[PDB]
Short mmCIF file of C-alpha atoms and ligand atoms in Angstrom, two decimals:
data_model
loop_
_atom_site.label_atom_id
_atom_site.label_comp_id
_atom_site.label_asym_id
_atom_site.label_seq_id
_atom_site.Cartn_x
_atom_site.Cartn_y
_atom_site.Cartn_z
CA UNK J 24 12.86 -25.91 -9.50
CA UNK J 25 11.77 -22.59 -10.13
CA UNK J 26 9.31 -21.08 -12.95
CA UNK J 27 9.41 -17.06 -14.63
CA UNK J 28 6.60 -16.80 -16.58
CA UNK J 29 5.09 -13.83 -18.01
CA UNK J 30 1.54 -12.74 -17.96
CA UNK J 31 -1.44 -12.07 -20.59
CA UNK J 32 -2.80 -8.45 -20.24
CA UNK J 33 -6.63 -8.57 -20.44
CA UNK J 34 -7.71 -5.17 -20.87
CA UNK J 35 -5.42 -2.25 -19.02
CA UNK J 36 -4.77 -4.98 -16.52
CA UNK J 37 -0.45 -4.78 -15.85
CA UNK J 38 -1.86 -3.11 -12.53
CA UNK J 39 -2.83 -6.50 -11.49
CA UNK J 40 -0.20 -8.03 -13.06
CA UNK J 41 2.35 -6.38 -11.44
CA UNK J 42 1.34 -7.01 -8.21
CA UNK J 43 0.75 -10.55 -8.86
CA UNK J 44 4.27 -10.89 -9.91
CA UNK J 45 5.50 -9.11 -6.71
CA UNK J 46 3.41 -10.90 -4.14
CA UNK J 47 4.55 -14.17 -5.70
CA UNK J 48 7.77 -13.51 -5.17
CA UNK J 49 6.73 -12.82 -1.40
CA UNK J 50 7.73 -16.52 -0.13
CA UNK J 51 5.27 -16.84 2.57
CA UNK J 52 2.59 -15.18 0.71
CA UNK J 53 3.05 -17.60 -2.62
CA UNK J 54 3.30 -20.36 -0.09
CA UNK J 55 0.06 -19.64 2.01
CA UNK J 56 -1.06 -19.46 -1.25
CA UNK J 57 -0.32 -22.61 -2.65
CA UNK J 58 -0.83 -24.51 0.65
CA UNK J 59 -4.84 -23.31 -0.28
CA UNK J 60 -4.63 -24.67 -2.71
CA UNK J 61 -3.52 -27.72 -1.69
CA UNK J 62 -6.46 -27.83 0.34
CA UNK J 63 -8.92 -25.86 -1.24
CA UNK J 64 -13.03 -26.61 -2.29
CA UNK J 65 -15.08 -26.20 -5.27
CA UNK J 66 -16.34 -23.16 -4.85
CA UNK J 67 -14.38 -20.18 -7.04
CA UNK J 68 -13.84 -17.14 -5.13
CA UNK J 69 -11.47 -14.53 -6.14
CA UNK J 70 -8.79 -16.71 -3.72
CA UNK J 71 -9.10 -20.23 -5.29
CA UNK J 72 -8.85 -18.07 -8.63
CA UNK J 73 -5.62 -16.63 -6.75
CA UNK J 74 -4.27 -19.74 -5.81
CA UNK J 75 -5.25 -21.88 -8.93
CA UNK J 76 -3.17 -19.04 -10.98
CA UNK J 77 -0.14 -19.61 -8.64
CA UNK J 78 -0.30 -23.24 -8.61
CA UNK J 79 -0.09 -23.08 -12.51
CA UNK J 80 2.43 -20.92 -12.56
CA UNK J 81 5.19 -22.91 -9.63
CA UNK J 82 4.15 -26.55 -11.82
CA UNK J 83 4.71 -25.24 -15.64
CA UNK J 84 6.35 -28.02 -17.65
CA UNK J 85 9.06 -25.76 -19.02
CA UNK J 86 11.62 -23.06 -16.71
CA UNK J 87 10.38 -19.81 -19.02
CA UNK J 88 6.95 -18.45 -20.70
CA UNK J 89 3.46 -16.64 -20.29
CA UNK J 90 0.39 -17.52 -18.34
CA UNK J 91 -3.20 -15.96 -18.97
CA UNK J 92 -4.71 -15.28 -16.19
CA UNK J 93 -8.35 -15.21 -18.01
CA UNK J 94 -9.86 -16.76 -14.60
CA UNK J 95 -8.70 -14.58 -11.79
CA UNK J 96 -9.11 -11.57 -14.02
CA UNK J 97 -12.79 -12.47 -14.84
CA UNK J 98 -13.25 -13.07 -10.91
CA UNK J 99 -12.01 -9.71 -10.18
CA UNK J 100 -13.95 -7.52 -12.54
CA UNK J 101 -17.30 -9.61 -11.03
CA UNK J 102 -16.30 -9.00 -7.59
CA UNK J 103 -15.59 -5.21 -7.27
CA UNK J 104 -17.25 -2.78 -9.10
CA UNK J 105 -14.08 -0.26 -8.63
CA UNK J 106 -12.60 -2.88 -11.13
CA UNK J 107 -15.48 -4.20 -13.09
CA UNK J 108 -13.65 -2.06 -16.14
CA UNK J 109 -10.99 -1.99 -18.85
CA UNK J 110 -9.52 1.20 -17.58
CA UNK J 111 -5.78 2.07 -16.24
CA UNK J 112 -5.99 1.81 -12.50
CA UNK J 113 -3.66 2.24 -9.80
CA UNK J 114 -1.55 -1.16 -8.16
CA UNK J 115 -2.07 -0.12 -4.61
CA UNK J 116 -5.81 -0.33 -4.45
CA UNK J 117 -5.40 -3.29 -6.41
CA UNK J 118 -2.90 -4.88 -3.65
CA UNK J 119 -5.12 -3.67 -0.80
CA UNK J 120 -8.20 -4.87 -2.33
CA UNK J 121 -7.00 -7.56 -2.75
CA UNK J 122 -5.45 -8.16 0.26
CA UNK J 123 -8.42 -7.36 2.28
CA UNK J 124 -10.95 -9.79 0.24
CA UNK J 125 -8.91 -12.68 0.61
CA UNK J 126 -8.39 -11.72 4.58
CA UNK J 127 -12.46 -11.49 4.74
CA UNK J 128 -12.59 -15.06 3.11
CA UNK J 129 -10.10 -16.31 5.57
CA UNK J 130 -11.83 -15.10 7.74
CA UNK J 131 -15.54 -16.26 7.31
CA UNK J 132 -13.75 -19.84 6.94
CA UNK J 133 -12.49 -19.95 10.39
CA UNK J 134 -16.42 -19.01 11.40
CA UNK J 135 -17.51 -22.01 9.27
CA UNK J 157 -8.57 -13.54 15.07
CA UNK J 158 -5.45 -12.83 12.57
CA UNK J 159 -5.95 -14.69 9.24
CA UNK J 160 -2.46 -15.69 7.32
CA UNK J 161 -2.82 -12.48 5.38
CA UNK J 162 -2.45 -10.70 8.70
CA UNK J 163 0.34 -12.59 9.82
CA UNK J 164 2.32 -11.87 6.44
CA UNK J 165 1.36 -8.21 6.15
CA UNK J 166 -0.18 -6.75 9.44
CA UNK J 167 2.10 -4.38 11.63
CA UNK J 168 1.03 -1.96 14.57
CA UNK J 169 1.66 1.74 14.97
CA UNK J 170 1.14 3.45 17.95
CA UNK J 171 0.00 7.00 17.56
CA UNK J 172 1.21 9.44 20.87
CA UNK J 173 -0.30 12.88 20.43
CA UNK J 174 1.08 15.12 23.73
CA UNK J 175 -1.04 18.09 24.68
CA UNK J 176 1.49 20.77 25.36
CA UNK J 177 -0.65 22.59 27.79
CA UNK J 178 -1.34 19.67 30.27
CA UNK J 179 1.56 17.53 29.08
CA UNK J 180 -0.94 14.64 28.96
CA UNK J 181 0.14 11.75 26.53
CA UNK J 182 -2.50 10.00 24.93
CA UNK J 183 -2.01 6.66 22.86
CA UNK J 184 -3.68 4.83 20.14
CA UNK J 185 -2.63 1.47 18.65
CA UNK J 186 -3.57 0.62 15.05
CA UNK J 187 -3.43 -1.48 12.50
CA UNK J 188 -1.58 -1.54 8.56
CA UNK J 189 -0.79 -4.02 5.64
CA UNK J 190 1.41 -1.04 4.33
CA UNK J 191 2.78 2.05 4.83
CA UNK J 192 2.30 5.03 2.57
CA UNK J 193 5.09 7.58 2.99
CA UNK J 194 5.60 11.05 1.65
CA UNK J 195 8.96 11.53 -0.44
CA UNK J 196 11.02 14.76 -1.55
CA UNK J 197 13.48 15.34 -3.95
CA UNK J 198 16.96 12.82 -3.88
CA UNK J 199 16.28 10.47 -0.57
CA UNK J 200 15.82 7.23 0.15
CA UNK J 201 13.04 5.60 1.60
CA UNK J 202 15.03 4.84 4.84
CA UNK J 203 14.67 8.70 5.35
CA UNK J 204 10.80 8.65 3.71
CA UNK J 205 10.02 5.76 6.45
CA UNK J 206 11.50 7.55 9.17
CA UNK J 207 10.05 11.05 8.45
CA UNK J 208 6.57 9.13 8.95
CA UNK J 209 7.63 8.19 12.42
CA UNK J 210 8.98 11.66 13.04
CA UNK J 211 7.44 14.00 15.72
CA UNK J 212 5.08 16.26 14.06
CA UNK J 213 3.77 19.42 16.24
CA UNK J 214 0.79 20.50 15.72
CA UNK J 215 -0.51 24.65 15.94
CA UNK J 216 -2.89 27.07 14.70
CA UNK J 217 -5.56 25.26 12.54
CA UNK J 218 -4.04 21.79 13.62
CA UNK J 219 -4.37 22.02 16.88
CA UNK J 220 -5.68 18.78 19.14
CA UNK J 221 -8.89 18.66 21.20
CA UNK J 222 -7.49 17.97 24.29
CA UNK J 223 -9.76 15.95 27.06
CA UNK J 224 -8.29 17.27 29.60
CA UNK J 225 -7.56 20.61 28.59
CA UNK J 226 -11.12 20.17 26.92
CA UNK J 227 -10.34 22.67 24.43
CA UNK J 228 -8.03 22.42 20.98
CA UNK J 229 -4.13 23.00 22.54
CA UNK J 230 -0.99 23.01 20.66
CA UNK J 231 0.29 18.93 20.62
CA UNK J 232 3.25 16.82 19.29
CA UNK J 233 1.91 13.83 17.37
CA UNK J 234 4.17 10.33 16.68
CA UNK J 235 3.22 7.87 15.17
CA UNK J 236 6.06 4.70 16.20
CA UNK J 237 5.95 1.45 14.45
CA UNK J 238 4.93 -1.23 17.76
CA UNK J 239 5.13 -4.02 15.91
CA UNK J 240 7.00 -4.72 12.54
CA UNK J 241 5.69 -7.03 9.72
CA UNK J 242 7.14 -10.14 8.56
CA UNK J 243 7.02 -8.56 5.10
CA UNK J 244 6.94 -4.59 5.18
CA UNK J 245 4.83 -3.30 1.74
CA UNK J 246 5.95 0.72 1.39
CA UNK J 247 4.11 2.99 -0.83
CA UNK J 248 5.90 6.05 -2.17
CA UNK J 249 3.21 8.74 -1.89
CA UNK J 250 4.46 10.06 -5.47
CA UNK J 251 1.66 12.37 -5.90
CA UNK J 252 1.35 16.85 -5.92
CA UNK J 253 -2.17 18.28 -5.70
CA UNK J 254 -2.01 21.64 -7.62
CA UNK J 255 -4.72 23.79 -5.58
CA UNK J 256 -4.79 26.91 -7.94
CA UNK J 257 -4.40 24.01 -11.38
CA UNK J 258 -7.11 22.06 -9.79
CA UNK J 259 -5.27 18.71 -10.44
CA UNK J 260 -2.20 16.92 -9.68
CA UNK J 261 1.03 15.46 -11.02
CA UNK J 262 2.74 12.52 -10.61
CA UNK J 263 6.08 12.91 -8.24
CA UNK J 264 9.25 11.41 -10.13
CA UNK J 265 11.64 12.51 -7.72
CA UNK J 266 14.63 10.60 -7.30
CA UNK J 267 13.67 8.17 -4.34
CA UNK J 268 16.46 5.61 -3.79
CA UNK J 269 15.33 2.09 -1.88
CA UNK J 270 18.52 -0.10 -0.60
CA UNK J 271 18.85 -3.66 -0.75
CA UNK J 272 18.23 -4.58 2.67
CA UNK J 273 16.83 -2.19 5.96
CA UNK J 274 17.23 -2.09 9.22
CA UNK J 275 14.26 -1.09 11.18
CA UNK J 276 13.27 -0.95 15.23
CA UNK J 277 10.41 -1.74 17.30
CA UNK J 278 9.02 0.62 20.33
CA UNK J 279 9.03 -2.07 23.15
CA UNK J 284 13.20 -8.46 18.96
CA UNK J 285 14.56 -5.04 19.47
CA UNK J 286 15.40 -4.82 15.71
CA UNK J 287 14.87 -7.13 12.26
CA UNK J 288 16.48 -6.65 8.94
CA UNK J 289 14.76 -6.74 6.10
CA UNK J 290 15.91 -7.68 2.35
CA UNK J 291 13.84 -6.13 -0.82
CA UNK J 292 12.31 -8.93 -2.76
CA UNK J 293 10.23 -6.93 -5.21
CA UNK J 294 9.53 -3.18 -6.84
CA UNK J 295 6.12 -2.71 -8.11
CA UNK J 296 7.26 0.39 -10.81
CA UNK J 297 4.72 2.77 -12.68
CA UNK J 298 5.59 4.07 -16.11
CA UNK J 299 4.45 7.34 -17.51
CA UNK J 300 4.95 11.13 -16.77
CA UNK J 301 2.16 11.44 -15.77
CA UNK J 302 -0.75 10.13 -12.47
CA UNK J 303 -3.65 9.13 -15.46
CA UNK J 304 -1.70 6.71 -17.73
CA UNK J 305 1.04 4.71 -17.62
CA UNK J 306 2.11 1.52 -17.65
CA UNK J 307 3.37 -0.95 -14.51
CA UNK J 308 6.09 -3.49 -14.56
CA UNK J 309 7.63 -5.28 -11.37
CA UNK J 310 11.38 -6.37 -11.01
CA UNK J 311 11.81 -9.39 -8.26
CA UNK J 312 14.97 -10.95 -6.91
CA UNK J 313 15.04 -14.80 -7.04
CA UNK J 314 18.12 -16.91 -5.88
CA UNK J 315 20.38 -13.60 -5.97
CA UNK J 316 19.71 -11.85 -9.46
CA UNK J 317 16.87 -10.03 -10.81
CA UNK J 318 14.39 -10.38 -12.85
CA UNK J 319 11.85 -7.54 -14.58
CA UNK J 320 8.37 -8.75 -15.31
CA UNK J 321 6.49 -6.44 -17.86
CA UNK J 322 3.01 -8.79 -18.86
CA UNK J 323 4.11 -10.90 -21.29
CA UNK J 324 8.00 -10.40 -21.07
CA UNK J 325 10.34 -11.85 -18.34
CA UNK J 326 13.91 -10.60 -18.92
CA UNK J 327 16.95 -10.68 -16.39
CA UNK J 328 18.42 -6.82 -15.41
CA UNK J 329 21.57 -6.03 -13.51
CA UNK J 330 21.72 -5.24 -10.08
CA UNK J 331 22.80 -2.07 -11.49
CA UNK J 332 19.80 -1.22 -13.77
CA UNK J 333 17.56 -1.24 -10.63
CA UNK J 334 18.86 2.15 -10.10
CA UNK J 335 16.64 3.53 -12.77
CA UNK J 336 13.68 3.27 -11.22
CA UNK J 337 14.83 5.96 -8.46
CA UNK J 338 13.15 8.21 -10.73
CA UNK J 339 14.54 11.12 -12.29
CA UNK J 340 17.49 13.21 -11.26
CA UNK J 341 16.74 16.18 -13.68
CA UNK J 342 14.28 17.30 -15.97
CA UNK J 343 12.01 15.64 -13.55
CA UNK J 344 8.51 16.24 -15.08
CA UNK J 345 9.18 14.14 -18.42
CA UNK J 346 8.27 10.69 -18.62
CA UNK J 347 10.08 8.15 -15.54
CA UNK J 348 9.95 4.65 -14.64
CA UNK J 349 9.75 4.97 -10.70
CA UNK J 350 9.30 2.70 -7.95
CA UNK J 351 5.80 3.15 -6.70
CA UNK J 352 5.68 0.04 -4.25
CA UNK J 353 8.58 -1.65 -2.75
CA UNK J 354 8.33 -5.27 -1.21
CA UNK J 355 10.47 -5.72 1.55
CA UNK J 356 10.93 -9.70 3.62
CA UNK J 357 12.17 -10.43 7.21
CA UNK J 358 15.11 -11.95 7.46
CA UNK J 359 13.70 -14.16 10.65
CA UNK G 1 -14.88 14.13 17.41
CA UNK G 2 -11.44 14.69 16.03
CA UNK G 3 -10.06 13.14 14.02
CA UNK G 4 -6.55 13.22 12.43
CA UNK G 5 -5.88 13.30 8.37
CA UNK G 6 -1.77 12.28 7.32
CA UNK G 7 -2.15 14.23 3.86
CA UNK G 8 0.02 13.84 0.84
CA UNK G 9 3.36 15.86 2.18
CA UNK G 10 3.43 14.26 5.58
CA UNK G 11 1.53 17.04 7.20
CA UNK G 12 -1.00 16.10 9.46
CA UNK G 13 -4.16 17.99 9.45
CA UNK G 14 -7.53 17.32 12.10
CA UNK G 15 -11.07 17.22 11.27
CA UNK G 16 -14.07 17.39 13.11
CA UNK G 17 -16.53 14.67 12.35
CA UNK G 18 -19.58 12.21 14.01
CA UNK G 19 -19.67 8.50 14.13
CA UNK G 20 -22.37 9.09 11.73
CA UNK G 21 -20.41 10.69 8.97
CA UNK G 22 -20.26 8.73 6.09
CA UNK G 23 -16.78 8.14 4.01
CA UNK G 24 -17.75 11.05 1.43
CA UNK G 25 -18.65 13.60 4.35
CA UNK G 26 -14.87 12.79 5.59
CA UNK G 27 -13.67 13.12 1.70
CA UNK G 28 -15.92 16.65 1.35
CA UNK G 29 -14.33 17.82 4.47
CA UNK G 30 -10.62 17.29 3.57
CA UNK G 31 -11.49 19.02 -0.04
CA UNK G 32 -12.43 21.60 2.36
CA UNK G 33 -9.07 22.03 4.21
CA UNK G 34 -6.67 20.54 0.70
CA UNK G 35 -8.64 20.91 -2.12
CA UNK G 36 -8.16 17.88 -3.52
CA UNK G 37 -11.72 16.59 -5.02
CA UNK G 38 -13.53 13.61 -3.29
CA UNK G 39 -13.52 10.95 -6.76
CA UNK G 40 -9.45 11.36 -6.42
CA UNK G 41 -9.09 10.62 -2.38
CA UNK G 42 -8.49 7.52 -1.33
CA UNK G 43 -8.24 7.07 2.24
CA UNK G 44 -6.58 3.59 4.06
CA UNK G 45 -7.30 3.13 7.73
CA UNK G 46 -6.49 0.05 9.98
CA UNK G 47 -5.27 -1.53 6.60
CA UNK G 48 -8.03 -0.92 4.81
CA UNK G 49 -9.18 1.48 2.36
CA UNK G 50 -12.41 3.15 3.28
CA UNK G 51 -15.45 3.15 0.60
CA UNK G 52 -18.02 5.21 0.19
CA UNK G 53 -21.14 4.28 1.62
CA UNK G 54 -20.13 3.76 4.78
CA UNK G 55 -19.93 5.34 8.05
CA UNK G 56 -16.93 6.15 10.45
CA UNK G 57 -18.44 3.85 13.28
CA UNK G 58 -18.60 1.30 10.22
CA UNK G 59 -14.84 1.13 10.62
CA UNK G 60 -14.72 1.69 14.66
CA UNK G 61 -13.12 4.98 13.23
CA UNK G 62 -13.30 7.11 17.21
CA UNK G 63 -11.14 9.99 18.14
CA UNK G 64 -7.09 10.15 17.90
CA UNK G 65 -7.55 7.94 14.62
CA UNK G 66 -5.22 9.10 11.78
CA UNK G 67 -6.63 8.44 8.11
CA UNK G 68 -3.77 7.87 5.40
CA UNK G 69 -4.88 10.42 2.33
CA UNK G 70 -3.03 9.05 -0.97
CA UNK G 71 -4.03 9.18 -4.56
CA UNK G 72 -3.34 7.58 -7.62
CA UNK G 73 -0.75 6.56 -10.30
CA UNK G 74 -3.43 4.91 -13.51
CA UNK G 75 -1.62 2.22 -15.77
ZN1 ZN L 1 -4.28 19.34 27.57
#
């Protein structure tokens, strides 16, 4: 019963597409989504435009083709002036825009707590920062739909994800304002996951600021992402976690490029560039790494990986 | 207050800022300490990313918190 169907680029717009592709291949999300609108009103917001698109796309007559999504991309250029432009933009703030607006409408509906948005997305760090003078712990709980993690040269995201949980200690120019101490003291800093999400969104911070060049490059190190994680929680002990979808930016460079998305369905994978649906080998997936050498030219890396609960 | 700033290696760095502070103070300070210019910072916090405009207490933003610094990748 399933549907792979391309989709019409409006302008610069595979940033959007991209995403769309990977969040509907997100099961809960594309069915939260189509439950709205299921049950949804007249009035057009950039969600009924959401969930009108997805409801096209899961009842298409035929298995294979393209969708133009001329509504939801009109919506979006009237509702944020950050997009209200044909220009290349980056899929993050497009999936956390995003994201966040259709939270806020879920939200104002229940006015007439956590929306489904949260309950899909939302996790919990808790941030410890330890003054090493007093030894007093202080801790601060808060709040993601993703995590954006820093990555070096030939890793894997496993390693990227548990460098950002790492204990960091801070000195010199870094040092913490202690309250007790009330005066900056040297500290250890953690930030633990408290509470994982039933889909975990990870964002390869793939990015160099050149301080003498006065810009920055794009980072195509070779970052490899596995199949399926294992990951803890701080107080289910555990949950695994299966990759459902790679949101991939094209180009050598951080100004232009082009994004594509490959998603697994039913145990193969597909790669969704606008218009063009085409099945890949498991083994292809292992191009968008990034590069091993020559690592400033021109690479097809993962830039946002989509990764579902198993419970 | 301090505040706490995960930058684009990893490294945390602090920053000393008021309630008041709008989103571009916070961006103008971290071009102070990174030089990285305020039009190519984005900053997420509590899930959200944090627009210009607004203040710190906008976002309940008090001490400890740790802003996410990324950037972008166009297409
Ligand atoms: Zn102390």
């Amino acid at each position: 019963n399933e549907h792979y169907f391309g989709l019409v680029n409006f302008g610069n717009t595979c940033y959007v597409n991209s995403v769309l592709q990977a969040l509907y291949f997100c099961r809960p999300f594309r069915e939260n989504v189509l439950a709205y609108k299921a049950q949804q009103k007249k009035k057009e917001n950039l969600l009924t435009c959401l969930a009108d698109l997805f409801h096209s796309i899961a009842t298409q007559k035929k298995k294979v083709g393209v969708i133009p999504p001329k509504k939801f991309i009109s919506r979006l250029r009237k509702e944020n002036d950050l997009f209200d432009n044909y220009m290349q933009q980056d899929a993050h703030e497009f999936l956390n825009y995003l994201l966040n607006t259709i939270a806020d409408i879920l939200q104002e509906e229940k006015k007439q707590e956590l929306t489904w948005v949260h309950e899909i997305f939302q996790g919990t760090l808790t941030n410890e920062t330890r003054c090493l003078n007093c030894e007093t712990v202080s801790s601060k709980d808060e709040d993601f739909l993703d995590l954006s993690v820093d990555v070096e040269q030939n890793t894997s995201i496993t390693h990227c994800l548990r460098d950002f949980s790492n204990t960091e200690t801070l000195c010199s120019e870094q040092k913490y304002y202690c309250e007790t101490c009330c005066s900056k003291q040297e500290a250890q800093k953690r930030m633990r996951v408290k509470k994982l999400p039933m889909i975990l969104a990870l964002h390869l911070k793939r990015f160099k600021y050149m301080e003498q060049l006065r810009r920055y490059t794009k980072l195509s190190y070779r970052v490899v992402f596995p199949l399926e994680l294992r990951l803890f929680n701080t107080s289910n002990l555990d949950r695994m976690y299966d990759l459902v979808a790679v949101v991939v930016h094209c180009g050598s460079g951080p100004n232009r490029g082009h994004y594509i998305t490959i998603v697994k369905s039913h145990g193969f994978w597909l790669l969704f560039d606008d218009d063009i649906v085409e099945k890949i080998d498991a083994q292809a997936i292992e191009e968008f790494y990034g590069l091993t050498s020559d690592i400033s030219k021109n690479s097809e890396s993962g830039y946002i990986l989509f990764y579902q609960s198993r419970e | 207050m301090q505040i706490f700033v995960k930058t684009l290696t990893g490294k945390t760095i602090t920053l000393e800022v008021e309630p008041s502070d709008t989103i571009e103070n916070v961006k103008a300070k971290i071009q102070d300490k990174e030089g990285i210019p305020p039009d190519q910072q984005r900053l997420i916090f509590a899930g959200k990313q944090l627009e210009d405009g607004r203040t710190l207490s906008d976002y309940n933003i008090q001490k400890e918190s740790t802003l996410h610094l990324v950037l972008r990748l166009r297409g």
